[PDB]
Design a protein around this nucleic acid. Structure first.
Ligand SMILES: Nc1nc(=O)n([C@@H]2CS[C@H](COP(=O)(O)OP(=O)(O)OP(=O)(O)O)O2)cc1F
Ligand SMILES: [Mg+2]
Ligand SMILES: [Mg+2]
Lengths: 388, 545
DNA sequence: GGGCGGCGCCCGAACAGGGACTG
DNA sequence: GTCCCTGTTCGGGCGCCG
């Protein structure tokens, strides 16, 4: 094995386990019985002071155990540009390959987790890992050499195919037709015994209303929106539009746009088409992803690292709906895009109450990773700024 | 005897040693109890005599057990607890009788001298030194040490594991040493299985004395009385004093909270409000008239007989919620119409400003989590809120909010939003431009408005803030306007507060604003960026400055 | 009379994040 | 930045169980 240490001056995770439903607990009990009978995990006691929450997800009657290693990954010692330009990209779960490499003995105490019981019939049953656990930052790092030795022949025989690895997944991108793309994916699945479309992702720009008649209210709202947007695009000018609002007028009074204000509005429409200047991706800083609920199944999002220096802006437009489910789906979509583009997941500012999210988010999760997030009492102003 | 189970290896915190506390004086009766206990335990090898090679010590004492004349031996291990490593507790919660399923046969038994049967790590025994007014050390788990509950619970789980494997269809609710054992066997086969379980435990050094072997209902378990088809809570005696201290209030509120699991309608908010800023426990707190009435209502509802039923997994879980004032809610979880699994309250005040839809959503979340714990699934909800009210709220609310499968119930008081902000400006409504300024040095401020019809007003304020002056300006516009009004505000603080449609607030100013808003017919609230020369916000800004 | 752990409730203290402000 | 406001978490009291 290889020795793995924590970051200097940091202890292991001590995160309490959250309530699980009966089906998840049963799936976890079966999976852990198999893993224990195969030597992957071992029962432990309370003299280990560490813990990491665990749950399960059902994709497409086969359950998958998912361990929330966010804290442990955060406390553990420390990219193809063409992947985002491929016609088709398939995601493949390769986590099982980690169960063949043993884990450093002194590190195993940090991977502890606790299976709960319905109605607290029984105290929590605690395990620790004996092998590279799925969802841990160290697993792809320590397995990298074996993975490269595995994937060398398939890359040689297919130089135009882009295979990139994030924690538990291989992203395989090709430019050829669907049907042959699935054939190459099946060939790679054969080789591993030793559906996205990134070129269609679009940016959602800021757009100004088009009217034949403008009230004092319309112009005040437009001026506020442009004053906000000028923090991102310094070319935005507001003087001539604000001229039309001198005095103390009624909100429903109709204001005719002068030639100066019309030209200024056209210039501002043109300026909002150019890309933001001076936005450089910092690998040492975190990706911040903000989401706004626009209503009627619409969601806007921005990915940035510094204020007003957006790396990306986009939307997720669903159509008796469920806000929490749509929000988790939007989070997973944004995270997939961020992984494909920059090879890293963003920290989310979620417009939802903490308890609602933590109560219902695991019922709609389908990915093998979990991003960091925090909860926001969002302002309606920024919600109006990115409206469509 | 002593369990032949392997010990759990514990260690002191790095760079620390064992405690050296001196024994405090004890009553001769306590001394006799302790010497009898210690002679008995030393004969069995649970404690070992030590000598001068042991430099540590920790005080001991004894209390009266729940039984008639038995004494429990305790050690004030607070120092050793400070010096001892951290553990991860394995007790994740408390089992509830509403989560039990119907069993043909039930037994309740209790392990005798539970802690004193589980061995202690040899290397650690040194630190458990004590003196009976003879010095000893512990070879088993002592009572008073912080690592004893978790070590015992884990050891008990390991001991029961082979029996649970061999008997997957015998259900064993294992709270610390109390075991509830349920089966679908006839009574004879059930007693045979119980004897098998007792012999299994005895093989692992855990006796099950007959004096605590319950074989017929009602079973006393976890503070409940379990009958075949029903369960009740052992009686709750609420204090009936004439003078009320803070400690008495805490005891009464705790008893009422414990009662609310099966008694519907319990309310504690007005009694809890009596505990703001009180210094110590002995502080006498005269009861408020509202607190008096709340206590009287609770006392009356506690006089009625009530019981629960057990869980049938082949039927739906239904949680029905009812509203009372002051931000308080009750709920009943049942499967058959008038047969409650359990009941509960919810009274948390989340945030400086809120309304009843937010509180209903929060109560739904709490009930959902509690139900996931107790039954492992989410219930179907009956809520006193129109589908149209919820549609409006979650359509117009900027946050992601969702209620699981629910249906409307016709029981007042219905949950409603008390006013609606317009989406568009109002024709024929006077347009108020409001603003407030505050001096961060003198704390003096001004609030005021101008209107498109020529009116302007400015109010001076003392000991205020910028946010407060903005709220005051909005309030002044609401006061001096007609039934329909357009208001253009400077402050996204006040706009964000009002757009959430609060009906209740801890701020008196926001409460007055809410009153005004409810009185109005149409309100449209718009925002403009400050200090940008946008009329007539320009005029108000110049005025209040 | 006290010691221990779990869960619950409520309240206050400490701390974090964001917006408005001076000059 | 400072001041103000709001939200979270954690620790203290009590209750319940062992
Ligand atoms: N107040 C208590 N403090 C404790 O530390 N305990 C611990 C945790 S559970 C364990 C039970 O111990 P025992 O079996 O010796 O005592 P018991 O009265 O529960 O039963 P029994 O007299 O041995 O039949 O003692 C129990 C208490 F009630
Ligand atoms: Mg006992
Ligand atoms: Mg202002």
């Amino acid at each position: 094995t290889v020795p793995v240490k924590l970051k200097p001056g940091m202890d292991g995770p001590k995160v309490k386990q959250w309530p699980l439903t009966e089906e998840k607990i049963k799936a976890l009990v079966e999976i852990c019985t198999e893993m224990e009978k195969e030597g992957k995990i071992s029962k432990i006691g309370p003299e280990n002071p560490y813990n990491t929450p665990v749950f399960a997800i059902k994709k497409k009657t086969k359950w998958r155990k998912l361990v929330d290693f966010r804290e442990l990954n955060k406390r553990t010692q420390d990219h193809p540009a063409g992947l985002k330009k491929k016609k088709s990209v398939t995601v493949l779960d390769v986590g099982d390959a980690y169960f063949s490499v043993p884990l450093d003995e002194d590190f195993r105490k940090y991977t502890a987790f606790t299976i709960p019981s319905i109605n607290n019939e029984t105290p929590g049953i605690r395990y620790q890992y004996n092998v590279l656990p799925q969802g841990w930052k160290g697993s792809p790092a320590i397995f990298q050499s074996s993975m490269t030795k595995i994937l060398e022949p398939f890359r040689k025989q297919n130089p135009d195919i882009v295979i990139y690895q994030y924690m538990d997944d291989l992203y395989v991108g090709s430019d050829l037709e669907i049907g042959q793309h699935r054939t190459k994916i099946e060939e790679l699945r054969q080789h591993l015994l030793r559906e996205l479309h990134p070129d269609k992702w679009t940016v959602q720009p800021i757009v100004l209303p088009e009217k034949d008649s403008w009230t004092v209210n319309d112009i005040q709202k437009l001026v506020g929106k442009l004053n906000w947007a000028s923090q991102i695009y310094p070319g935005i000018k507001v003087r001539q539009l604000s001229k039309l609002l001198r005095g103390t007028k009624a909100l429903t009074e109709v204001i005719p746009l002068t030639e100066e204000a019309e030209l200024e509005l056209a210039e501002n429409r043109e300026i909002l088409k150019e890309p933001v200047h001076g936005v450089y991706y910092d690998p040492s800083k975190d990706l911040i992803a903000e989401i706004q609920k626009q209503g009627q199944g619409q969601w806007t999002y921005q990915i940035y690292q510094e204020p007003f220096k957006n790396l990306k802006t986009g939307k997720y437009a669903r159509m008796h709906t469920n806000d929490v489910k749509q929000l988790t789906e939007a989070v997973q979509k944004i995270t997939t895009e961020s992984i494909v583009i920059w090879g890293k997941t963003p920290k989310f500012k979620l417009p939802i109450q903490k308890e609602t999210w933590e109560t219902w988010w695991t019922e709609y999760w389908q990915a093998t990773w979990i991003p960091e997030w925090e909860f926001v009492n969002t302002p309606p102003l920024v919600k109006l700024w990115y409206q469509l | 005897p002593i369990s032949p189970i392997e010990t759990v290896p514990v260690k002191l915190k790095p760079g620390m040693d064992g405690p050296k506390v001196k024994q405090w004086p004890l009553t001769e009766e306590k001394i006799k109890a302790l010497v009898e206990i210690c002679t008995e335990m030393e004969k069995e090898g649970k404690i070992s005599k030590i000598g001068p090679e042991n430099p540590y010590n920790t005080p001991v004492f004894a209390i009266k057990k729940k039984d008639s004349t038995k004494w429990r031996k305790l050690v004030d291990f607070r120092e050793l607890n400070k010096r001892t490593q951290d553990f991860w507790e394995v007790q994740l919660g408390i089992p509830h009788p509403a989560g039990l399923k119907k069993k043909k046969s039930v037994t309740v038994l209790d392990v005798g001298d539970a802690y004193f049967s589980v061995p202690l790590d040899e290397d650690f025994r040194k630190y458990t030194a004590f003196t009976i007014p003879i010095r000893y050390q512990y070879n088993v788990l002592p009572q008073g040490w912080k690592g004893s509950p978790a070590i015992f619970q884990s050891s008990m789980t390991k001991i029961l594991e082979p029996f649970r494997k061999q008997n997957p269809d015998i259900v064993i609710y294992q709270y610390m040493d109390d075991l509830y054992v349920g089966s679908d066997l006839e009574i004879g086969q059930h007693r045979t299985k119980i004897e098998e379980l007792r012999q299994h435990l005895l093989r692992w050094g855990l006796t099950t004395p007959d004096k605590k072997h319950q074989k017929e209902p009602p079973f006393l378990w976890m503070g409940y009385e379990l009958h075949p088809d029903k369960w009740t809570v052992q009686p709750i005696v609420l204090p009936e004093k004439d003078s009320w201290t803070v400690n008495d209030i805490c005891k009464l509120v705790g008893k009422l909270n414990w009662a609310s699991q099966i008694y519907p309608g319990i309310k504690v908010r007005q009694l809890s409000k009596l505990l703001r800023g009180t210094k110590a426990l002995t502080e006498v707190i005269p009861l408020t008239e509202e607190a008096e009435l709340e206590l009287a209502e609770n006392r009356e509802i506690l006089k009625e007989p009530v019981h629960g039923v057990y869980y049938d997994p082949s039927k739906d879980l239904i949680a029905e919620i009812q509203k009372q004032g002051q931000g308080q809610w009750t709920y009943q979880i049942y499967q058959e119409p008038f047969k409650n699994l359990k009941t509960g309250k919810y009274a948390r005040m989340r945030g400086a400003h809120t309304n009843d839809v937010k509180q209903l959503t929060e109560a739904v979340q709490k009930i959902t989590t509690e139900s996931i714990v107790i039954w492992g699934k989410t219930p179907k909800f009956k809520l006193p809120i129109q589908k149209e009210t919820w549609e409006t709220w979650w359509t117009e609310y900027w946050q992601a909010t969702w209620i699981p499968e629910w249906e409307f119930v016709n029981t007042p008081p219905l949950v409603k939003l008390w006013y609606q902000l317009e989406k568009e400006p109002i024709v024929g409504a006077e347009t108020f431009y409001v603003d407030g300024a505050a001096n961060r040095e003198t704390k003096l401020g001004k609030a005021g408005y101008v209107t498109n019809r020529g009116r302007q007003k400015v109010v001076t304020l003392t000991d205020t803030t910028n946010q407060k002056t903005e709220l005051q300006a909005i309030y002044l516009a609401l006061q001096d306007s007609g039934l329909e009004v357009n208001i253009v505000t400077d402050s996204q603080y006040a706009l964000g507060i009002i757009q959430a449609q609060p009906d209740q607030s801890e701020s008196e100013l926001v409460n007055q604003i809410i009153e005004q808003l409810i009185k109005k017919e149409k309100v449209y609230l718009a925002w403009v960026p400050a200090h940008k020369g946008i009329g007539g916000n320009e005029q108000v800004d110049k005025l209040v400055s």
